Amino acid sequence: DGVGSSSGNWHCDSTWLGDRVITTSTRTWALPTYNNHLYKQISNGTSGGSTNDNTYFGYSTPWGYFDFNRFHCHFSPRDWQRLINNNWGFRPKRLSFKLFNIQVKEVTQNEGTKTIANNLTSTIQVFTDSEYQLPYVLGSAHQGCLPPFPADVFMIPQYGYLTLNNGSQAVGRSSFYCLEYFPSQMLRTGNNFEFSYTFEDVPFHSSYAHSQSLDRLMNPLIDQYLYYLSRTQSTGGTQGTQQLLFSQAGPANMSAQAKNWLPGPCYRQQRVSTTLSQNNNSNFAWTGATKYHLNGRDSLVNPGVAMATHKDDEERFFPSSGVLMFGKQGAGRDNVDYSSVMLTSEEEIKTTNPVATEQYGVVADNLQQTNTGPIVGNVNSQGALPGMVWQNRDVYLQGPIWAKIPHTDGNFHPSPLMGGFGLKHPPPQILIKNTPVPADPPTTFSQAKLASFITQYSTGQVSVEIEWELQKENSKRWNPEIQYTSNYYKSTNVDFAVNTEGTYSEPRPIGTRYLTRNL
Amino acid sequence: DGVGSSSGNWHCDSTWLGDRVITTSTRTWALPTYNNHLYKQISNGTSGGSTNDNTYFGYSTPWGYFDFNRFHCHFSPRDWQRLINNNWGFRPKRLSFKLFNIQVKEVTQNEGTKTIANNLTSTIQVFTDSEYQLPYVLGSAHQGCLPPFPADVFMIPQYGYLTLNNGSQAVGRSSFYCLEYFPSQMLRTGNNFEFSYTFEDVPFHSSYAHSQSLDRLMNPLIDQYLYYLSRTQSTGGTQGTQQLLFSQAGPANMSAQAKNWLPGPCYRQQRVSTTLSQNNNSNFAWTGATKYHLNGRDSLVNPGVAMATHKDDEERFFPSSGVLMFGKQGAGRDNVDYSSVMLTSEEEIKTTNPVATEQYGVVADNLQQTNTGPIVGNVNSQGALPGMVWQNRDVYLQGPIWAKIPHTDGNFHPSPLMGGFGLKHPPPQILIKNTPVPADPPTTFSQAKLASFITQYSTGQVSVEIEWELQKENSKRWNPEIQYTSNYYKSTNVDFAVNTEGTYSEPRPIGTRYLTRNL
């Protein structure tokens, strides 16, 4: 462990061993100094135009943290293709992390002349919340993950959290955390850091589509031995009389056959078309949105319960807030045009989950009588029922991977709504910070704390390795399958490559449900 | 492994052990930073004046690579003489490579004042494509090899490759490679790198000339017991009549004797003389050139199939594109005069291979009859025939060494047309790159990737060692032999030495076929 020797090699690879696949990636990071080594109370109440729905209260810390909760951080596009085109399901098993080749540099800004030199004696601090004692900030689709293209250098995000509030004020249950209160490890140039982690058991992800629909499971050649009320009036003429009349459903009345199962739950959203002329001429992006009310404040249901994006022949429609929406390369931050974002589509689950923009069904509304015609009413939101079967939301190459299940008393099907694996003990957070170095102190003692430090930052490499378990397909389907492939026609650039400027780009989102399977 | 200790010694030598000879050379290299650590799409279509024949599409990488595919990189001129004057053939056996004494320096450009300092903590990355997964760019006679004179310092070339295209656009089969996706090794000052390699079996190079011609293998004293049609008319007067007349060829008609073998294949090229007045007054360097048509675009046949440069007493002639052409020291790049280049000559293979500027022969053209005189026609291109025997193109002290055989289904005599050894698993490519070091990042998080780095470069030593196998001659020739020797008459400078300026120079090309041998 000397200054003149490296502390690790560049491991970036992926191997396939059958039911196993082991990904490995390495990147170069840079860590600035946040908040001038200060903790700061941050808050925003209903002051100004800030509505009650957007109030908060929390703290910003001088620490940074690593993030790789994104699939494209570990799979090349070719590897994603290899995976999704040949396997029915998969799940992670283990993980390894490593930091090495640390180098700290200080910057002297003198009369515009900016100079950078090495500071061989400075340190950084690193520790992992292996006991889940800090607010778990990962799993919220924040930026700052590892770049997709390994040749990119990225900046480490700053750590901050929120707690309970009342407007812009705190309450008696508000918590304050000081990260320095944790046992941490200090590294100089020549030290390295690493640790390992094991995933808890979790069901495989359903990387397939169903080749049958829920309402078409019967034999199309034979009838049932059951009966159903086929008619409640006399089949005669204009003098119809009350009668109770039954028949056996069969091939010509499959809509009436008795069934054993039932579609999954729903929470109706607002439908909107990509043909601007087909929409209402008014701004109802927030007014007509599907929200939920909690503690007096309202919140948008995004993306909400996994439901079918649209029924057949209606690809121009999509739920207002029921679809993951990625932005194209170099897209602006606020209020961009539709042409710069890429909409996903969960159409593949039409077989079991209801369409997100229609009612679950229709149910009896009153007690019919001789003088009262029967009335029926729409169901726009339906909780779980015994016999319901549904599918989860699909994952994507540039989507999240896992999320932490909130530690509460009860829950129901703890799969993350944004898609991925829900865990009780997710991979622990990894935090990092530059150790402060004070400038020259005064010559006489003073009680006041130091406030002048040397401006500096640091950089180094980081590597992650994940082992995945595979579930190979075992189909007996005769005809060929649908596979994700790239276009065969000539184009100016190559998909998933660099421009003439070296700017990486992803042309479209990529799901994982291509293979098929019976219900 | 400390900063204050060297990591290797200067090994530059050559030893002879009988059938073995072991060369060893060491040089000093310098590696800049290419493309500002960016991959860039490069292409050129039929736009502008660029003809369809010169379109391409590919990528330029921020990596450099080592090259020693040149004979003068391992043999001194004296050693080349020692080798070619005493052995019939040779071939390589093993190879060893080594990097050491690395030192990285960063340059600060401030107000014209350029300062250079050491950066003890920076690294470089090095790896070898030992599985031939990257486009093999070596074996194309590119510049950037090790300098001939060991006292020179050289610059490492930049790596780039090409793929399929349509004009200036890519197609569905175009491939894009990211070199960072390979497992690589990182070295600081004090680390070293090395590896070994073994050559596959390969026939010896024919370092000799034939003392007999193919058409003069018979005994000059005895006749044959065979016959040949000697005459088809009556030997009488002006009243010649049809007759079938035969005789035995012997010493006086060796051109008519029956033979067992046949000259090698040919592909006729255009002849041109060094006496400017003897050539046609028109520009036909491209129009009259020998080309070949592939995928709609035409390409020049250079240097083409190994054929004799010229027949006896015609040394002023040479094929337009059938001869390796080296440039003298300090020669310009584009459109220099003939007086500044050095033409080789494959005259030594006149015994078996056809002259490159004449027809292979002449063959029957129609069915002769009493009323139809026989017609015969030239053959200007001839494929392989059973019984053909030919020789390969000669190698040179400043020529290439090996080339990689393209991985296809079929081939035919896979010897590189430019001369040398054809291999299925050539020595692997060695790639190198400066690890990027970002400047001070901003104080608040930002999604955009880093784009400001510290300007730096690196340098060090490199050594190569190759073991060769020899094939000693076993002649019984009585009279003395032809040997390559230097001129005995006084001159201003010494061949293969430095000027008064220390500029090394090579006065002429040097083949390897001096000794003789029977057919």
Query: DSSP string covering A41-101, please?
Result: EEEE-S-TT--GGG-EEEEEEEEEE----SGGGT--HHHHHHHHTTEEEEEEEEEEEEEEE
- Chain A contacts of B3, Cβ < 8 Å? 2-4
Residue with tokens 């065979």: B226
Among chain A residues, CA nearest to B439: A116
B425 secondary structure, DSSP code: S
Partner residue facing B454 (CB), from A5, A116, A501: A116
Judging by DSSP bridges, how do beta strands A402-404 and B381-382 pair with one another?
unpaired
Partner residue facing A457 (CB), from B111, B182, B440: B440
Partner residue facing B183 (CB), from A11, A488, A499: A11
Q: Quick one: A446 exposed, middle or buried, by C-beta within 10 A (0-12, 13-18, 19+)?
A: exposed
- Chain A contacts of B181, Cβ < 8 Å? 12-13, 76, 150
Cα distance from B174 to chain A (closest Cα, Å)? 7
DSSP helix/strand/coil, A170: coil
- Chain A contacts of B435, Cβ < 8 Å? 28
Contacts with B468 (C-beta within 8 Å, 6 or more apart), sequence order: B20, B21, B22, B23, B90, B91, B92, B93
If one counts every other C-beta atom within 10 angstroms of the C-beta of residue B332, the result is: 9
CB contact under 8 A, B189 and A107: no
Determine phi and psi for B242, rounding to 5 degrees: -55, 125
d(C-alpha B437, C-alpha B454), whole Å: 6
- Chain B contacts of A115, Cβ < 8 Å? 108, 110
CB contact under 8 A, A502 and B40: yes
Cα distance from A69 to chain B (closest Cα, Å)? 16
CB contact under 8 A, B438 and A105: no
Total count of residues recorded for chain A: 519
Question: Most distant CA pair in chain B: distance in Å?
Answer: 112
Token pair, residue A379, equals 């169901």
Closest CA to A6 of B299, B495, B187: B187
DSSP helix/strand/coil, A340: helix
Type of residue numbered B316: R
Partner residue facing B437 (CB), from A31, A459, A496: A459
Mutate to test the interface with A, among B5, B42, B121 (most CBs of A within 10 A): B121
- Chain A contacts of B186, Cβ < 8 Å? 6, 8-10, 101, 461
CB contact under 8 A, A151 and B450: no
Experimental approach: cryo-EM
DSSP helix/strand/coil, A385: coil
On whether the CB atoms of residues A305 and A265 are closer than 8 A, the answer is: yes
Determine phi and psi for B321, rounding to 5 degrees: -140, 40
Partner residue facing B40 (CB), from A34, A457, A501: A501
d(C-alpha B164, C-alpha B172), whole Å: 9
d(C-alpha B103, C-alpha B31), whole Å: 11
If one counts every other C-beta atom within 10 angstroms of the C-beta of residue B444, the result is: 10
Closest CA to A10 of B438, B463, B125: B125
On whether the CB atoms of residues B42 and B160 are closer than 8 A, the answer is: yes
Please tell me what resolution, in angstroms, this structure has.
2.6
A1-519 folds as Empty Capsid Viral Protein 2 (2.170.30)
Judging by DSSP bridges, how do beta strands A153-155 and A20-31 pair with one another?
parallel
CA angle centred on B240, ends B236 and B241, rounded to 5°? 115
A295 secondary structure, DSSP code: T
Total count of residues recorded for chain B: 519
**Helical spans, DSSP H, in B134-178:** none
B330: left (phi over 0), alpha (psi -120 to 50) or beta: left
